[PDB]
Design an enzyme around this catalytic site. Structure first.
Site, mmCIF file in Angstrom:
data_model
loop_
_atom_site.group_PDB
_atom_site.id
_atom_site.type_symbol
_atom_site.label_atom_id
_atom_site.label_comp_id
_atom_site.label_asym_id
_atom_site.label_seq_id
_atom_site.Cartn_x
_atom_site.Cartn_y
_atom_site.Cartn_z
ATOM 1 N N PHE A 116 -0.468 5.211 25.695
ATOM 2 C CA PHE A 116 0.595 5.581 24.772
ATOM 3 C C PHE A 116 1.509 6.660 25.342
ATOM 4 C CE2 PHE A 116 1.200 3.828 20.602
ATOM 5 C CZ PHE A 116 2.116 4.651 19.967
ATOM 6 N N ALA A 144 4.990 13.199 -9.719
ATOM 7 C CA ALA A 144 4.869 14.641 -9.830
ATOM 8 C C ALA A 144 6.277 15.206 -9.834
ATOM 9 C CB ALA A 144 4.072 15.200 -8.675
ATOM 10 N N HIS A 174 12.435 8.029 16.547
ATOM 11 C CA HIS A 174 11.682 6.972 17.215
ATOM 12 C C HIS A 174 12.661 6.084 17.974
ATOM 13 C CE1 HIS A 174 7.914 4.447 17.381
ATOM 14 N NE2 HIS A 174 8.815 3.583 17.812
ATOM 15 N N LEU A 191 10.536 -0.481 11.916
ATOM 16 C CA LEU A 191 9.844 0.018 13.100
ATOM 17 C C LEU A 191 9.287 -1.093 13.980
ATOM 18 C CD1 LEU A 191 8.900 2.867 14.383
ATOM 19 C CD2 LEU A 191 6.635 2.039 13.793
ATOM 20 N N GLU A 196 5.733 2.022 19.240
ATOM 21 C CA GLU A 196 5.691 2.549 20.604
ATOM 22 C C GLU A 196 4.598 1.843 21.407
ATOM 23 O OE1 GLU A 196 7.029 6.503 21.631
ATOM 24 O OE2 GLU A 196 4.972 7.091 22.111
ATOM 25 N N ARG A 215 8.663 10.880 22.668
ATOM 26 C CA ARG A 215 9.456 10.169 21.660
ATOM 27 C C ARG A 215 10.881 10.723 21.524
ATOM 28 N NH1 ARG A 215 6.000 6.225 18.464
ATOM 29 N NH2 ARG A 215 4.370 7.369 17.345
ATOM 30 N N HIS A 258 12.522 8.766 12.126
ATOM 31 C CA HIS A 258 11.172 8.225 12.009
ATOM 32 C C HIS A 258 10.152 9.201 11.425
ATOM 33 C CE1 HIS A 258 7.639 5.823 13.222
ATOM 34 N NE2 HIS A 258 7.133 6.967 13.648
ATOM 35 N N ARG A 306 6.601 15.472 17.845
ATOM 36 C CA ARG A 306 5.319 14.792 17.649
ATOM 37 C C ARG A 306 5.000 13.815 18.784
ATOM 38 N NH1 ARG A 306 5.478 9.932 15.173
ATOM 39 N NH2 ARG A 306 3.512 8.763 14.978
ATOM 40 N N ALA A 333 1.213 8.549 18.116
ATOM 41 C CA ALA A 333 -0.152 8.192 17.677
ATOM 42 C C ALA A 333 -1.003 9.394 17.238
ATOM 43 C CB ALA A 333 -0.887 7.334 18.733
HETATM 44 C C1 LIG Z 1 7.599 5.733 8.872
HETATM 45 C C2 LIG Z 1 6.589 5.234 9.868
HETATM 46 C C3 LIG Z 1 5.658 6.149 10.351
HETATM 47 C C4 LIG Z 1 4.699 5.768 11.289
HETATM 48 C C5 LIG Z 1 4.675 4.447 11.740
HETATM 49 C C6 LIG Z 1 5.605 3.526 11.248
HETATM 50 C C7 LIG Z 1 6.570 3.912 10.314
HETATM 51 C C8 LIG Z 1 7.557 2.886 9.816
HETATM 52 N N1 LIG Z 1 3.751 4.066 12.652
HETATM 53 C C9 LIG Z 1 2.850 4.962 13.121
HETATM 54 C C10 LIG Z 1 1.882 4.599 14.056
HETATM 55 O O1 LIG Z 1 1.826 3.429 14.484
HETATM 56 N N2 LIG Z 1 0.993 5.514 14.508
HETATM 57 C C11 LIG Z 1 1.035 6.786 14.056
HETATM 58 O O2 LIG Z 1 0.214 7.634 14.467
HETATM 59 N N3 LIG Z 1 1.969 7.156 13.148
HETATM 60 C C12 LIG Z 1 2.884 6.275 12.665
HETATM 61 N N4 LIG Z 1 3.808 6.659 11.758
HETATM 62 C C13 LIG Z 1 3.822 8.046 11.256
HETATM 63 C C14 LIG Z 1 2.736 8.161 10.171
HETATM 64 O O3 LIG Z 1 2.344 6.844 9.742
HETATM 65 C C15 LIG Z 1 3.149 8.975 8.943
HETATM 66 O O4 LIG Z 1 3.323 10.353 9.296
HETATM 67 C C16 LIG Z 1 2.098 8.868 7.837
HETATM 68 O O5 LIG Z 1 2.086 7.527 7.331
HETATM 69 C C17 LIG Z 1 2.342 9.817 6.668
HETATM 70 O O6 LIG Z 1 1.194 9.784 5.825
HETATM 71 P P1 LIG Z 1 1.074 10.697 4.509
HETATM 72 O O7 LIG Z 1 -0.182 10.329 3.757
HETATM 73 O O8 LIG Z 1 1.293 12.133 4.920
HETATM 74 O O9 LIG Z 1 2.320 10.214 3.605
HETATM 75 P P2 LIG Z 1 2.533 8.679 3.157
HETATM 76 O O10 LIG Z 1 1.534 7.826 3.893
HETATM 77 O O11 LIG Z 1 4.003 8.347 3.255
HETATM 78 O O12 LIG Z 1 2.102 8.673 1.607
HETATM 79 C C18 LIG Z 1 2.907 9.218 0.563
HETATM 80 C C19 LIG Z 1 2.054 9.309 -0.704
HETATM 81 O O13 LIG Z 1 2.507 10.346 -1.580
HETATM 82 C C20 LIG Z 1 2.835 9.823 -2.872
HETATM 83 N N5 LIG Z 1 4.036 10.496 -3.437
HETATM 84 C C21 LIG Z 1 5.207 10.721 -2.822
HETATM 85 N N6 LIG Z 1 6.029 11.372 -3.676
HETATM 86 C C22 LIG Z 1 5.362 11.553 -4.834
HETATM 87 C C23 LIG Z 1 5.678 12.140 -6.058
HETATM 88 N N7 LIG Z 1 6.893 12.686 -6.268
HETATM 89 N N8 LIG Z 1 4.755 12.162 -7.050
HETATM 90 C C24 LIG Z 1 3.539 11.621 -6.872
HETATM 91 N N9 LIG Z 1 3.212 11.047 -5.702
HETATM 92 C C25 LIG Z 1 4.102 11.002 -4.672
HETATM 93 C C26 LIG Z 1 3.015 8.324 -2.687
HETATM 94 O O14 LIG Z 1 2.620 7.587 -3.850
HETATM 95 C C27 LIG Z 1 2.101 8.027 -1.515
HETATM 96 O O15 LIG Z 1 0.772 7.764 -1.971
#
Ligand SMILES: *Cc1cc2c(cc1C)nc1c(=O)[nH]c(=O)nc-1n2C[C@H](O)[C@H](O)[C@H](O)COP(=O)(O)OP(=O)(O)OC[C@H]1O[C@@H](n2cnc3c(N)ncnc32)[C@H](O)[C@@H]1O
Ligand code: HEM
Ligand SMILES: COc1[nH]c(=O)c(C(=O)[C@@H](C)C[C@H](C)[C@@H](Cl)CCl)c(O)c1OC
Ligand code: SF4
Ligand code: F3S
Ligand code: FES
EC number: 1.3.5.1
Lengths: 102, 239, 613, 138
Positions: C122, C170, C245, C255, C258, C289, C356, C400, C403
């Site tokens: 990677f 929230a 990205h 996406l 990578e 990246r 990204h 960042r 991965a």
């Molecule tokens: C955007 C992205 C990121 C990504 C990726 C592909 C894409 C399109 N591929 C990756 C990969 O192959 N390998 C890797 O290491 N990283 C990769 N990334 C980055 C990574 O996936 C992200 O940083 C990660 O997914 C973020 O996870 P996190 O748990 O921190 O956040 P989330 O998964 O987006 O979940 C959001 C949750 O919060 C809840 N939420 C949001 N707002 C509210 C409010 N206002 N109230 C209540 N709940 C809320 C959502 O419901 C969700 O559950």
């Protein structure tokens, strides 16, 4: 845990393959015995089949037990009727042959 | 200019009297993205914002935007609008489910059913976990391909007519395929009692291989086939 | 008040977010015998983390033989020395423990001849502290790691009595005398309002890509937790640092991982040259990246475009064996065909660098404890935590490493749990609350619900996105950054003007997307202001006018006969941004990055160097 | 909260609500497999009904079978009608027979991929017509 549901399901296919084995067996060998085994296989496979439709569509508590009871009645009367017809009339195979060359 | 009509199911639970009906919209395709979601989102942002629906990844991997487009259950961000301007696109909520508002179905039962099959690895000896990676050969791993990719659309089970009439007591293909997914996971020690949970008329046995599930799957998965394997296992498994 | 029903809840802990991190923290908490509510606006499985493709890093040494300390080095080096080494150490150290735990939960990792977890090459990862060639340590589930990761965590969480507040948005945090008491939340289902209060509150909301016009992230990445924090007067950290990205479709901006570049894939520009060798020779096209995308983005300005209007570049997957594409990367074979119409085996992909990742966020301990900045000094906010993309322990820094956020999620999920598990007992005093606390959010809810202004919600969202897209892009000058600030600032005014049309309680998405917009605008304000202020070129934040990388020293020559610069004269410090929500004004200070690790004798502090791949 | 408790909630919430049911058959477009399942039930039910109406009449009604065939000759043997009445008795039987084999093959786990399914469907359909015309002429 008893494996009832699955065992039932197995029987269903056993009779299905049994009934498939009998329609050529009836034609190639029409007789006394064949008439009964044909009636037996016919009435069971149908009884379970309708059962499967009932326990699909007939929604409720009271009605589910009712339909199932009335179906056991229809079945009992069906198997017994076909047996009577074998013993006291021409017998399914011969009835078919008569009904047909007509 | 290139215009496409959109007939969409509508229901506001907050306006008294108002009951289910369709609303028609009209969208220029040179200003719109190729997918039906793009269309939905566009009318939501430009025409009427009462249009309420579920969405997230717009990539067809999260399963948020599941709906019945033109008489079949797919994902709105994966289905493309038929460039044919001589037809009117009929957009419907996932079939035979309680309409919360417009294209938004109550999936809580769907989920609750998922919970009852216990979709997690189960070792007879949880006392050593988290310290050594479990061994599984690439061959044993291939058995999961075509199974683990499920997104939980509910396109699946909400196309099964058994799940229409018996959705309360019949788990339906989505959920079932996942139980299968855990039977053939070679790391799982609970392969037998997982089958005992299906020993009744409704759990698994409402299936009649109608095959609307496999046909409707937005991801090209085969729940119906996987079900057949369960059915086989149920008839063959020892003790 | 007469309008809205208030329904209070009492727990040991609230986790806001059921993504990767949220979940891990959620059940992790319940597991230690904690009564844990988990509030999430999407059904867990929908959380963006599904979208994740590449994989999750752990020095398990499954391909070659590895050492987590080399993974330590690589992260900190890629962080461009804004990365806090204390946290980075903790993460890489805990990496193999965390990934083994996930495979033990039942995550169907792809396998090797040994029957061990498959590790992949990677971007930016090395052996023997950056001298041992390419390191193969990306643990992965074919093309869909984030999917499997999220699904098993969710799956595993059902085993515990975690109280899931599903599709509850929230609104704010419940805050009393600098301490956090819980969250005030709108329940989307029936329009009701729920004051969920607990002793400890984990924020795990993920990023805010939806501030930009062209991003890889889902429609629901709206930095809602990030806002919630700046609405409580707490600072956000390093919000200018936005990772572009390198690869993703020209149109919808989906996406393409990578893991395409780490499996032998190449990048092709207009003339045909593998341009990733005249830009970065040492580590080739598997660089950072931010360096790869910088190479691409300027190549487009060079006239080397590859489309209908010459505004993007290619990622080629022609040369790879067909048998390996379907096995190692199946989920890009579909999405390249579906969104662009590309057979991956005998065609290239039209890939622009698009937004990204958000390195910036909620300032954080290696323990996950949310920080405030009292008197140039750090201070733990009592009963408040952050983890994953929402947070900023800055294990990532200015850039960042690929991965690592999936790992970031899991480690600092766990961490947030243990931090609570070890700072109190379950069933301890749940602090009381003012009868009318959260009054402000409900009032804000009502104003936005019956909002009959002049500017439609969608249009204001649009202007912000494009304003960010052109003013705070990949390359950015203080000229256009300055105009961008006062342009964003005008658009914050405009929020007082907005029009919403739906007036219902049930599933008012018209209302929530607008709450999402305020949540976005706040994240935007700090992003553009932090960017204009930073007069150096570190990681993803590259200034045209200040190409120099301003450290405490001039780290090119030896560190000896040369004096340290005063804090407020270098830029090797973290950005802390605030905003007076009414006037919409961004004031910003700085806090020093942590350079010491957790044990010099186990994991050496790595000092700043000339950085290039 | 257990999964069984979630379900109980689900029903009590919805059945005590003003929510409607998203249309199903009225809007779900028809695939050959789906129609070929209704027909299995259609035929399956009719066949069991026939058999039952043969066994029951063998218990309740007057006269023997020979006494009924001679009775059948009312408007009597009109080839291109007594063939037509004969065909429409074998037709549902032959369909349900052939499709039965298809169901049976499925239970073994074979031929369950969308193409295979719309192929065997045609093979069952064609086979019905042949063995139906063929038998009514025996
Ligand atoms: C955007 C992205 C990121 C990504 C990726 C592909 C894409 C399109 N591929 C990756 C990969 O192959 N390998 C890797 O290491 N990283 C990769 N990334 C980055 C990574 O996936 C992200 O940083 C990660 O997914 C973020 O996870 P996190 O748990 O921190 O956040 P989330 O998964 O987006 O979940 C959001 C949750 O919060 C809840 N939420 C949001 N707002 C509210 C409010 N206002 N109230 C209540 N709940 C809320 C959502 O419901 C969700 O559950
Ligand atoms: C030998 C030829 C036959 C074969 C091979 C056969 C096979 C089958 C099979 C395998 C099924 C269950 C498949 C499923 O829907 O899951 C079925 C259903 C059924 N069959 Fe038969 N069958 C035959 C003849 C008959 C006859 C003569 C009758 C009338 C007595 C009959 C009545 C039914 C009924 C009532 C059902 C259940 C309908 C449903 O729920 O789908 N079948 N058949
Ligand atoms: C084999 O089982 C089945 N197969 C079906 O195709 C099916 C259906 O197709 C249903 C949508 C309705 C259809 C008109 C039925 Cl009532 C005539 Cl048989 C249906 O309801 C069913 O029972 C569960
Ligand atoms: S198996 Fe396919 S159709 Fe069923 S829920 Fe999963 S993705 Fe949807
Ligand atoms: S739609 Fe159906 S009844 Fe079985 S084969 Fe599929 S679940
Ligand atoms: S929104 Fe993710 S599948 Fe359509």
């Amino acid at each position: 845990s008893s494996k009832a549901a699955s065992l039932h399901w197995t029987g269903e296919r056993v009779v299905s393959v049994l009934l498939l084995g009998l329609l050529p067996a009836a034609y190639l060998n029409p007789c006394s015995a064949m008439d009964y085994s044909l009636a037996a296989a016919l009435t069971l496979h149908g009884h379970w089949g309708i059962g499967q439709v009932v326990t699909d569509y007939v929604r409720g508590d009271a009605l589910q037990k009712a339909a199932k009871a009335g179906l056991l009645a229809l079945s009992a009367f069906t198997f017994a009727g076909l047996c009577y017809f074998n013993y006291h009339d021409v017998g399914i195979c011969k009835a078919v042959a008569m009904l047909w060359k007509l | 200019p290139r215009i496409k009509k959109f007939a969409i199911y509508r229901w506001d639970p907050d306006k008294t009297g108002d009951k289910p009906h369709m609303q028609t919209y009209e969208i220029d395709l040179n200003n719109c993205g190729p997918m039906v979601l793009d269309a939905l989102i566009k009318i939501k942002n430009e025409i009427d914002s009462t249009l309420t629906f579920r969405r997230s990844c717009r990539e067809g991997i999260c399963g948020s935007c599941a709906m019945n487009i033109n008489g079949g259950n797919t994902l709105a961000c994966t289905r493309r609008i038929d460039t044919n301007l001589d037809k009117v696109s009929k957009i419907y909520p996932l079939p035979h489910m309680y309409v919360i508002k417009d294209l938004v179905p109550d999936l809580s039962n769907f989920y609750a059913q998922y919970k009852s099959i216990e979709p997690y690895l189960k070792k007879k000896d949880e006392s050593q976990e988290g310290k050594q990676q479990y061994l599984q050969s690439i061959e044993e791993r291939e058995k999961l391909d075509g199974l683990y990719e499920c997104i939980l659309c509910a396109c699946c089970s909400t196309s099964c007519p058994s799940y229409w009439w018996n959705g309360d007591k019949y788990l339906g293909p989505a959920v079932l395929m996942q139980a299968y997914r855990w039977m053939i996971d070679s790391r799982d020690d609970f392969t037998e009692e997982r089958l005992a949970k299906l020993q009744d008329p409704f759990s698994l046995y409402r299936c009649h291989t109608i095959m609307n599930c496999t046909g409707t799957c937005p991801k090209g998965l085969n729940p119906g086939k996987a079900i057949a394997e369960i059915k086989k296992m149920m008839a063959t498994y020892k003790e | 008040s007469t309008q809205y029903p208030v329904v209070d809840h009492e727990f040991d802990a609230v986790v806001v977010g059921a993504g990767g991190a949220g979940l891990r923290a959620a059940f992790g908490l319940s597991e230690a015998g904690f009564n844990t509510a988990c509030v999430t606006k999407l059904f867990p499985t929908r959380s963006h983390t599904v979208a994740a493709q590449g994989g999750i890093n752990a020095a398990l040494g499954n391909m070659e033989e590895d050492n987590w300390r080399w993974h330590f080095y690589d992260t900190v080096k890629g962080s461009d020395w804004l990365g806090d080494q204390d946290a980075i150490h903790y993460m890489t150290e805990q990496a193999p423990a965390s990934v083994v735990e996930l495979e033990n939960y039942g995550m169907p990792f792809s396998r090797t001849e040994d029957g061990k977890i498959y590790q992949r090459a990677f971007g930016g990862q090395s052996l023997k502290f950056g001298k041992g060639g390419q390191a193969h340590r990306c643990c992965c589930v074919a093309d869909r790691t984030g999917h499997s990761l999220l699904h098993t965590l969710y799956g595993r969480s059902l085993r515990y009595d975690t109280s899931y507040f599903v599709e509850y948005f929230a609104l704010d945090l419940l805050m009393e005398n600098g301490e956090c008491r819980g969250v005030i939340a709108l329940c989307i289902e029936d329009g009701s309002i729920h004051r969920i209060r607990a002793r400890n509150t984990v924020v795990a909301t993920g990023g805010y890509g939806r501030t930009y016009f062209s991003c890889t992230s889902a429609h629901t990445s709206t930095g809602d937790g990030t806002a919630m924090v700046t609405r409580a007067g707490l600072p956000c950290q390093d919000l200018e640092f936005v990772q572009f990205h390198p690869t993703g479709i020209y149109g919808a901006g989906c996406l393409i991982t990578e893991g395409c570049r780490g499996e032998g894939g190449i990048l092709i520009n207009s003339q045909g040259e593998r341009f990733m060798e005249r830009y970065a020779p040492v580590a080739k096209d598997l660089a950072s990246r931010d360096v790869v995308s910088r190479s691409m983005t300027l190549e487009i300005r060079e006239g080397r475009g590859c489309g209908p209007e010459k505004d993007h570049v290619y990622l080629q997957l022609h040369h790879l064996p067909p048998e390996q594409l379907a096995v190692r990367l199946p989920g890009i074979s579909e999405t390249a065909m579906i969104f662009a119409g590309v057979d991956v085996t005998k065609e290239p992909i039209p890939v622009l660098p698009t937004v990204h990742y958000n390195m910036g966020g909620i300032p954080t301990n290696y323990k996950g404890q949310v920080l405030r900045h009292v008197n140039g000094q750090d201070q733990v906010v009592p009963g408040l935590y952050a983890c994953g993309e929402a947070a900023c322990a800055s294990v990532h820094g200015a850039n960042r490493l690929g991965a690592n956020s999936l790992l970031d999620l899991v480690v600092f999920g766990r961490a947030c749990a243990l931090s609570i598990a070890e700072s109190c007992r379950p069933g301890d005093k749940v602090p009381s609350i003012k009868p009318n606390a959260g009054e402000e959010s409900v009032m804000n809810l009502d104003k936005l619900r019956f909002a009959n202004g002049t500017i439609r919600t969608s249009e204001l969202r649009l202007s912000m996105q494009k304003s960010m897209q052109s003013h705070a892009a990949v390359f950015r000058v203080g000229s256009v950054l300055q105009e961008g600030c006062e342009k964003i600032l005008r658009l914050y005014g405009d929020l007082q003007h907005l029009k919403t049309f739906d007036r219902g309680m049930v599933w008012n998405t018209d209302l929530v997307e607008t709450l999402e917009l305020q949540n976005l605008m706040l994240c935007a304000l700090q992003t553009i202001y932090g960017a204009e202020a930073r007069k150096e070129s570190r990681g993803a934040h590259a200034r045209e006018d200040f190409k120099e990388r301003v450290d405490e020293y001039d780290y090119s020559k030896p560190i000896q006969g040369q004096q340290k610069k005063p804090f407020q004269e270098h830029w090797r410090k973290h950005t802390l941004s605030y905003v007076d929500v009414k006037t919409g004004k961004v004031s910003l200070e700085y806090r020093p990055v942590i350079d010491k690790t957790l044990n010099e004798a186990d994991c050496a502090t790595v000092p700043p160097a000339i950085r290039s791949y | 909260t257990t999964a069984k408790e979630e379900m109980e909630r689900f029903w009590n919430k919805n059945l005590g609500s003003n929510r409607p049911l998203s249309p199903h058959i009225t809007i779900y477009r028809w695939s050959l497999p789906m129609a070929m399942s209704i027909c299995h039930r259609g035929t399956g039910i009719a066949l069991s009904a026939g058999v039952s109406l043969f066994g029951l009449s063998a218990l309740l009604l007057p006269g023997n079978f020979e006494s009924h065939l001679e009775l059948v000759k009312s408007l009597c043997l009109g080839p291109t009608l007594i063939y037509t009445a004969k065909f429409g008795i074998v037709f549902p039987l032959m369909y349900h027979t052939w499709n039965g084999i298809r169901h049976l093959i499925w239970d073994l786990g074979k031929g369950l991929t969308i193409p295979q399914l719309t192929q065997s469907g045609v093979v069952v359909l064609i086979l019905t017509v042949l063995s139906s015309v063929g038998l009514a002429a025996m």
